[PDB]
Amino acid sequence: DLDTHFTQYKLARPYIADCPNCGHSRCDSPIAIEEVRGDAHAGVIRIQTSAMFGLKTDGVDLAYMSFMNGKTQKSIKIDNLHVRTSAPCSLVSHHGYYILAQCPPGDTVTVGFHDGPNRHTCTVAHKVEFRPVGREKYRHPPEHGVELPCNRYTHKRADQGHYVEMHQPGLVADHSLLSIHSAKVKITVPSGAQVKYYCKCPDVREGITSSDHTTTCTDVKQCRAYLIDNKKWVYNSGRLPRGEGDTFKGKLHVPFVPVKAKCIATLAPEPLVEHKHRTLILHLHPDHPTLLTTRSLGSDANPTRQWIERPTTVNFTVTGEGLEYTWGNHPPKRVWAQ
Amino acid sequence: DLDTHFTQYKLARPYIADCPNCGHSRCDSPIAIEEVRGDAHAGVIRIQTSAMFGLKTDGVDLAYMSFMNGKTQKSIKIDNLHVRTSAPCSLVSHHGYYILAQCPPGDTVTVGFHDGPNRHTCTVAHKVEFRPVGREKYRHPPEHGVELPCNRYTHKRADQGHYVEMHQPGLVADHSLLSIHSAKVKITVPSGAQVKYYCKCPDVREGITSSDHTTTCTDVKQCRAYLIDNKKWVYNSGRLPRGEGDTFKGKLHVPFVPVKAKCIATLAPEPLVEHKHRTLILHLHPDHPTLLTTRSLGSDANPTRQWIERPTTVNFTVTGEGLEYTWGNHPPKRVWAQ
Amino acid sequence: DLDTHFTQYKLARPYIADCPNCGHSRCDSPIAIEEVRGDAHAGVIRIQTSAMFGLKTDGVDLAYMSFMNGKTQKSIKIDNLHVRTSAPCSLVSHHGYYILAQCPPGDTVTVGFHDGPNRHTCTVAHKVEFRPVGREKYRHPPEHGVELPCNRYTHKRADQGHYVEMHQPGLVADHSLLSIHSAKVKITVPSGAQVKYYCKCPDVREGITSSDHTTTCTDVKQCRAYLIDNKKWVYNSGRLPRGEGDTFKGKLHVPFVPVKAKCIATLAPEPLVEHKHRTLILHLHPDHPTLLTTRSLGSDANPTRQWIERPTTVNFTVTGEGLEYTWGNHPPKRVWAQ
Amino acid sequence: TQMSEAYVERSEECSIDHAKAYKVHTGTVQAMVNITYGSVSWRSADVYVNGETPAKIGDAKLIIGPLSSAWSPFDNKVVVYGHEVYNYDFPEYGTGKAGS
């Protein structure tokens, strides 16, 4: 039933852009990333890469990725699609421009596939942190505990909660179209695609053509080697210049919509309760920083919130009205006084 | 020599268990992780996986590993075994269910081989800290310095210091036994292994057989599809059910017993000494936090010790009774005054 | 061009020294790391390995590596060369002994290709800290923002700002040369070599010779085989025994000298001013810990400088004399009062 | 020349996670009362506190309240975040300071 998303699959094409830190510098990688949404709880991150992986050229090979190299696209294997942070991540799912993965906390996020003879990596600076849902500020999803209503990105892809617009792309330059005709510059076409064309010298001023030659200018460096190729539209990225004509249709659903799932949260060890005369002593040992809250049941609340990390001993004046305390994400408990 | 530990080699067989974070979710990986033992000084880790690393089927191929793929095992090479934490680790030795490695400090531990078409990794939330031998709170073993009596796991395996019980595993369900005899649910056998068998509906109630057929029930999701296969024994894991028949013996030696070895420890830069009347002035330029302690040799000890991280200059009132101080792990020094 | 560096390209020889953490313990790795120089700003590291990168044995190349296995330089295609830190790095360029890479913050640096049947890696304990140029204690070079005169290492190689020594190699020991002929020990030389014969038995102790044999001594373990290969020269490394002769000259230019380049620095969000009677309420929303400096413009400077990380509102008493404040990398500004 | 434009649009996560400002009034309280009087030994009545509404479940009929204390733990301005309630003073609509 994965063939009901052809609007993303067919109407969209692979895309390339300014990666800020492509390898050792700022090259123009085919997998330039943008709008990483690290706002869930379970450590999952949604990344919108410029490359649009999904089905193959026509309709098949979900397990293949299709990026754009030079003038043309190239659908190849997805063998070494790598997503990294301060520590290496682990892929979960991918669809269209968006790839869903979970990462450990870190200061930067990197994405890189493998063509096989090439590395082709890209990264960006972006704070990534993940506080688990609950009162126990842990740092890795535990094996057991109690469940709470966290916020997490949907594991599925066939959803239409939100949409992203895909208009016609804007013309890209490519001076390799400007071949040499022994003494003049000679532009040639990819498939009959539109080539907006003109040089600093006065010559052909629009360019909507097959392979033209240049009468006036000679050096390729002063000529508009542009390709208007909106046979397959792209997302209105901030790294691609705008098509002056119009913003075409192609409203595309967001693949991984955040949903309110139920993550499994940690549970702190139960405190050792020791009773005295009209005072409650809580002998406890926290495994990870947990805040405990106390609240008197009388007219005056006298609340107290205190995160504790090292093992500590605390006291509480339990009045005749009574006292209640919440240690970690355990259910609240109340107490008497004689 | 290496074939003198057949108690574990032939008599034990790896099984599959419930990894907390297998791949991306809670799957049942064959490399399920148990009993991460981060107690050595030099950051050495022992891991007990449910997969059996070491010899081949009978007695050979130290460079091979054996895991369990469904109801049967398939020994392969150790081609791309990797144990990982916040930063990738470096494996030292593998034997039986246990792996020895040297990991950087970090909060999560992962173990994963590479079958070649799939990764099949596992990970568990379990912090691993670094505890430098001595009084110098370094982060990695230096290339020089004075050695100290640390405690560390030994790379050797031919030891008999400790044992762990290896009883007959509990039985395992395999719904792929429950084929269809065109209209009834139908159970085969792996090699004549004992197939405990029964359905919700009244039919054959024990199952100690070759390949049976069902007379009564119809649905494969309403029959017990079990395999008692204790011709080969398994570890007393807390993730497998225990066969109610009886608990077998057959305890085998633990591979890596902790030993009282001698690790190299860092040596802090020596202080610059300066002095005034009955007054030591001490210049310190630590590179890493190192504990300084001082002790007056008079009737009153008057001790003083403090961790110092930033470069600092301190003083000490040196009485005629004299004063001792121990910067880092340098031999203690002592003094008189005018 | 590339071939205009014959002094290091032709004459140098990949040497092997004592890596401190070669895999499990301190072996003798061909990539023994030396002189890690992480003194740049943007996080670029220069590493002087013991292997010789770039040049094939056959004059010059760049897609190849020369490392010394045994007595011979078994050069190969450089293919999977790792440069690791707390997180894996991304190398920029490699030239002979030196390899320039960009790393994330960490406390250990490890280098290693993986020749395939074997790994041959090496690490060393050395903290690496990356202070971005400017007033904002950032972590990674951002996509945008102002630029400042940083200092770092050029990727260019054809420089002669600094030189390093390179003299005759020392007497490398090789036990494998002390073969026996069932009656006496036989020495051997591969090609053009001139080994030294030394044995415990009372005999000729000097034994400088080409292919030859012992006089009387018979016990291999009671002899020494020193090898002389003065045809090439090696770096003056502190982990290699000095040759007993002259300091042969030849200044190998340092491929990557520091230069005064321009790095992109982060740009803190604009403060929200709110004027108040002779008081400047300043709303601040820092993204990363950024320095805030202010000073009165009157006779008394009244300086104030304090790092601010968590968003907070600070206020200052702007007198009629005037007040100046420099928030982050923004240009300084001034204010009055009524 | 480059013509760059940008506008702020609420995140996709707003559909699930979003704070809710609330201004509250006195309202009217309700109670569930169980009366096991006489020989009937049972009641399961939901009742109000206004001093007029009768409650005639089973056979008996009764009237409850009004409460002696007008104490309301809620303040005039209340902020609700998913599951927990905070009596934070949200400024007003269309006046929020940037960053706050």
Swiss-Prot record, chain D:
<feature type="glycosylation site" description="N-linked (GlcNAc...) asparagine; by host">
    <location>
        <position position="34"/>
    </location>
</feature>
<comment type="function">
    <text>Class II viral fusion protein. Fusion activity is inactive as long as E1 is bound to E2 in mature virion. After virus attachment to target cell and endocytosis, acidification of the endosome would induce dissociation of E1/E2 heterodimer and concomitant trimerization of the E1 subunits. This E1 trimer is fusion active, and promotes release of viral nucleocapsid in cytoplasm after endosome and viral membrane fusion. Efficient fusion requires the presence of cholesterol and sphingolipid in the target membrane.</text>
</comment>
<protein>
    <recommendedName>
        <fullName>Spike glycoprotein E1</fullName>
    </recommendedName>
</protein>
<comment type="subunit">
    <text>The precursor of protein E3/E2 and E1 form a heterodimer shortly after synthesis. Processing of the precursor of protein E3/E2 into E2 and E3 results in a heterodimer of the spike glycoproteins E2 and E1. Spike at virion surface are constituted of three E2-E1 heterodimers. After target cell attachment and endocytosis, E1 change conformation to form homotrimers. Interacts with 6K protein.</text>
</comment>
